[PDB]
Design a protein around this nucleic acid. Sequence first.
DNA 1: TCGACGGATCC
DNA 2: GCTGATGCGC
DNA 3: GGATCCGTCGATCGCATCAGC
Length: 276
Amino acid sequence: ALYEDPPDQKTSPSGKPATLKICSWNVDGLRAWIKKKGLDWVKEEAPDILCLQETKCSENKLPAELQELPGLSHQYWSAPSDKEGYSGVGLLSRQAPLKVSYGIGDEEHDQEGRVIVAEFDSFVLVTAYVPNAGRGLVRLEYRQRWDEAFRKFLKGLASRKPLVLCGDLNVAHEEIDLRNPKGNKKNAGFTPQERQGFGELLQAVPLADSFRHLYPNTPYAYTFWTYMMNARSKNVGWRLDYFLLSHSLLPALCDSKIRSKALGSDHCPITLYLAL
DNA sequence: TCGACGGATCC
DNA sequence: GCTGATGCGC
DNA sequence: GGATCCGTCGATCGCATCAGC
Ligand SMILES: [Mn+2]
Ligand SMILES: [Mn+2]
């Protein structure tokens, strides 16, 4: 069945108003997404921080519209080191971060422009585009290696500051997180190995699934739909895009949204409200 | 994701 | 710039 | 031996590249 995201809750569990609004979006081709009016949607949402995944766009080719964007003037981009039109992430912020870094510190895993770490006053933001296990599961062996290194990196990071992790984590954690769980247990994104990695990420860092924490029993809430077979119009999709939080920030959590109606990609954007 | 193939296996 | 083919992806 | 089931196994959509010129 179709899904309607509930209204934005903008106070914390103690009624402190939301001070920080982060939006994350796998744009699936940055240039195409801008031509499909993505930035119009971003300007109306007016986030304080905007994280993009799968930009498929070198730093030379970044369209001009992105400079004329003064609510998000501090902009950071990572592209693969030797693979054009593939992967890529960016982070755009209203306020400059204290410190920005690329990758996780493991050469093996830092060649495909997938991770930006931005340290602010009260917390660290990681945005990530996790490697897809691939058709026929060709990259499943590599993904489990990625998962373990990524988990260890985030565990280290969260021991020093509160952590927000957002982005396309390329796994649907539980059967409620996709429309066709039965038909997809040997497919990328829903293998038992990918579901276990997510579980161990939640437990080992530790982190909480912001959206599932607030709506633990809400089905049909998805962030991705394949372009094929008109899946989006039937809401035959997957929840692949997350905000994961240090438990300490759970009392700062106001809401975790899914903007199902914003068009322009095969993912919709997700939006996080925090009281900091 | 879907339909079309199989090759089972029951009524 | 243009065609046609390939890589990638839930 | 005619009908439903049940595991593969191809053809879709969309973006961006590449090879050639
Ligand atoms: Mn994509
Ligand atoms: Mn079946």
